[PDB]
Amino acid sequence: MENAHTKTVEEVLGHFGVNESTGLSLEQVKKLKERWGSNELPAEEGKTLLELVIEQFEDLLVRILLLAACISFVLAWFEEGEETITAFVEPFVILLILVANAIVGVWQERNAENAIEALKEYEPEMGKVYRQDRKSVQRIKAKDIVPGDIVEIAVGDKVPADIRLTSIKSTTLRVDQSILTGESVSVIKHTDPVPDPRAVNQDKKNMLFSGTNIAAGKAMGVVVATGVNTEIGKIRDEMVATEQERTPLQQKLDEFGEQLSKVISLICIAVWIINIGHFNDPVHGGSWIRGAIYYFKIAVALAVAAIPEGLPAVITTCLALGTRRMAKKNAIVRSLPSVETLGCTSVICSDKTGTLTTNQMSVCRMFILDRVEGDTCSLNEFTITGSTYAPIGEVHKDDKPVNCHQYDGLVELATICALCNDSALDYNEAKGVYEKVGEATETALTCLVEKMNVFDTELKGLSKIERANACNSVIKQLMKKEFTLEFSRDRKSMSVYCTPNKPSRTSMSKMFVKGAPEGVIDRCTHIRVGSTKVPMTSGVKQKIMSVIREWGSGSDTLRCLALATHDNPLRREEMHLEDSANFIKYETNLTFVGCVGMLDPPRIEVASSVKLCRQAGIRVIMITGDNKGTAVAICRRIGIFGQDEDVTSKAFTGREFDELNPSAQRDACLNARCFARVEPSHKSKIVEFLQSFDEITAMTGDGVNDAPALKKAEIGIAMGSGTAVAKTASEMVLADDNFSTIVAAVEEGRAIYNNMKQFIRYLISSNVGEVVCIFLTAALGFPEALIPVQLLWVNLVTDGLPATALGFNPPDLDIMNKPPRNPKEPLISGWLFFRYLAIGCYVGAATVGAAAWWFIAADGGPRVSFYQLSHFLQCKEDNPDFEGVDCAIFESPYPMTMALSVLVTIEMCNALNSLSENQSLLRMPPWENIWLVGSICLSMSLHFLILYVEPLPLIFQITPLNVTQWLMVLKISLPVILMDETLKFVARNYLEISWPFVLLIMPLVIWVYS
Ligand SMILES: Nc1ncnc2c1ncn2[C@@H]1O[C@H](COP(=O)(O)OP(=O)(O)CP(=O)(O)O)[C@@H](O)[C@H]1O
Ligand SMILES: [Ca+2]
Ligand SMILES: [Ca+2]
Ligand SMILES: [Mg+2]
């Protein structure tokens, strides 16, 4: 079987020896699964190791350090090129920090992608087949499908394998195959063969390809290729890589990194042009170009220092962390940066059926017309026991066991339910439960027909399997279903044309209609009382609607459907079934038979999740296609409304929302919390009206009618048990159907953004202190305290792991107690610009003050005055101002070591400030981030290494410090913590305690300041 689209249906079915009615035998499946194997693709990993490392060096900030590492190599290859431990130390320490951030970024990306692919194994994919063991449709694993078995295909499903369409149950079958073809339109499929043998997949209009979705209709066909033999498995690796639009924060940090790179270039140019006079200094040898090259190395070393080279890697780590944390809560995040968009979400739009409710429906109430006395009527209401899809339960009229065969209206009510279905009941021996095959609404009617048993059948000896479709089969054996007018949300109903297998001479053909109660009743001209029909008056109409309103608004919040019959329908030849808009013109002059009400319990997690969303400034909206009275009743149950709150202006329908003023329709989206009776076209219209008011919308849906709205939203969340049409159009899938995972994703989206601002706060406020150190020494005339190899060491220990370990920060204790941020506001927000300069001005003056301390106040050095330090260049033995001062001490490595040690230590104490924007160290101690504590102890260990081993101080031109000089370093480095505690204090109490830590920090403060 190679060209299946060229052969007809009878030839492709005879190739395997299959009947479309029965299906494939169990022995045939065993033989075919041996010859063809499992129906799956080999589990391949996304990106290799080298290509994952290559994408770490693709940003501007990282590519700048690569250029400077090359400059430091070419400009040092001329001077010294023999020893590799004293000459090329500058290019080595610029690369060593790039590899460190590349390793962490790759390590976290490997963890996020290994966690997501381990979540695809959560629940196995399923496919409805027809096999000979069961005389009905059974749901089996998708990987258990062999080439040649009959497969049932319904709307919303995902095609499990390459399928040659044998018959189309609906009038039209649409398939969304952008995954394979690339077309963004639904394509109509037919049964006739395509004569062209070399036809492209575009012209294969009779084949269903694995991985594609069903946009509309129901059909069935025979599988012709499984596993890697499908058109999607043969090009599984030869596929173009996706590229999505940059989210507002992704482009924010990109434009911020470029604006920062321009400022750094002006700062490094300013370094070269203010040190013009020092070019001809005797220290360089009296040469101008020799002194200009040296101060060019300083400009380059300060560029590497002041640049946040770790910003691209920390964004990668944060996004990979949030993705791995959601996968722990069973949330497959399809787009890595999309977990950030849920942080700034303002509105959460939610599908009702299947998303806010468990979709475990059960018919618990139904009524038919008892009699008519005048214009009004009396009804026969019933109750059904049971809430599971198991066909175990009986019907009670007024709390009395009754048999449905006595009531003629119930016999016709079960006939409409059984025949007007595209669903069935399936028994699972593995789990020992009854499962649904199709939609929960139609399966609830299948389980109802089994309980009623209007044609009393002996069910005492049937198996658990055959008892799932026992009474349903008795109905279908009596009436032959000719064609179905499939359910369309334009008319909100579904009709079926049936002809009795009984001789047609006495009994004619009828149409069995079912759909929305208010829509179907408006099209009913007569009503069925018992076995006779009388014309429908008005008093019957409001009396019937009154029971439907009391059921939806009642204590059970019942989902209601009306059942009708059309006794005099047009024949098939006089019906134009090409357009779906004509179907409502055929479902007129019906005969109202009955109305069923089923219960759909909301999920347990939904009630508390709506409360936490309201606490975090988020507004939850219910956009459902169901009735308004039912939707409002559910909103009061889950907490969207109050049990007594007025919803006259907060609950709207599809019609009411259309018939609104521009001012009224503006205030509606800003105040309405429930939208009922809205088509899939209206749902996306609600979403675009919310985004028109500059609001990040998060749509949650599970069905076909939510797919246009899941794409119009900034981020769409899909339930794991919903259709694949919705899971394809979404950015996050809740594999476990947990609604609490949605609020956990909002907290993770806010926490990711917080860790970025703490990374931005630590590097800007500390690297500007390394710039002030270079410029303040020049404005005072002091000997410069740093050389290019020391500006590159402070870049390694301070901008490396202590900066990346900020992406592991724990969340604030009130992270979810603040309104969502405005995504169009500026990033740094002005008041933080003051906090960056306030801390940076101290970090710079502390470094210059540490070098000036040794020249003046230290005992190990000279007691040089301020005048002799400001004019050290003017010192020779001829000068009477400089007497007794050995002016070779102005080149001593002691002030350079005091400044380098303070710069490292004051930036480690600044990393301890960057755990929260406003929470002090007494509330969030440093051991909340254990990765930051380990990174700081590692950076200090590396600083103590180059200080006290033998050959390293000569490389970095430093000297070992004693305890007396190290105690002075902490005296200047510690007040950077006290300075940020003051800035956090003003932020808490004017712009808006861990005692174990206090007992540890004060013995250090006692020893430092004596
Ligand atoms: N198989 C079916 N046959 C006939 N009518 C159906 C039907 N499924 C749903 N309906 C009716 O169509 C009406 C509107 O269509 P829609 O599909 O949007 O409802 P819904 O079940 O999806 C609720 P939600 O939008 O919250 O998921 C529903 O109120 C329902 O009564
Ligand atoms: Ca840097
Ligand atoms: Ca730094
Ligand atoms: Mg739904």
XYZ file of C-alpha atoms and ligand atoms in Angstrom, residues 304-307 309 762-768 770 791 794-800 803 903 907-908, ligand 3:
26
model
C 34.079 44.310 29.794
C 33.599 45.266 33.446
C 30.653 47.652 33.115
C 28.801 45.516 30.531
C 27.496 40.094 29.878
C 22.923 44.322 41.192
C 24.960 44.791 38.015
C 24.090 48.407 37.230
C 24.479 49.649 40.806
C 27.798 47.805 41.211
C 29.375 48.277 37.770
C 28.681 52.010 37.889
C 33.602 50.479 39.129
C 39.377 45.464 36.017
C 36.511 42.189 39.300
C 34.381 41.417 36.244
C 34.903 37.681 36.735
C 34.141 37.336 40.446
C 31.397 39.969 40.683
C 29.560 39.660 37.339
C 29.776 35.877 37.100
C 24.969 37.552 39.383
C 35.685 46.353 45.131
C 30.055 43.787 45.495
C 29.564 40.499 47.337
Ca 30.764 43.963 38.870
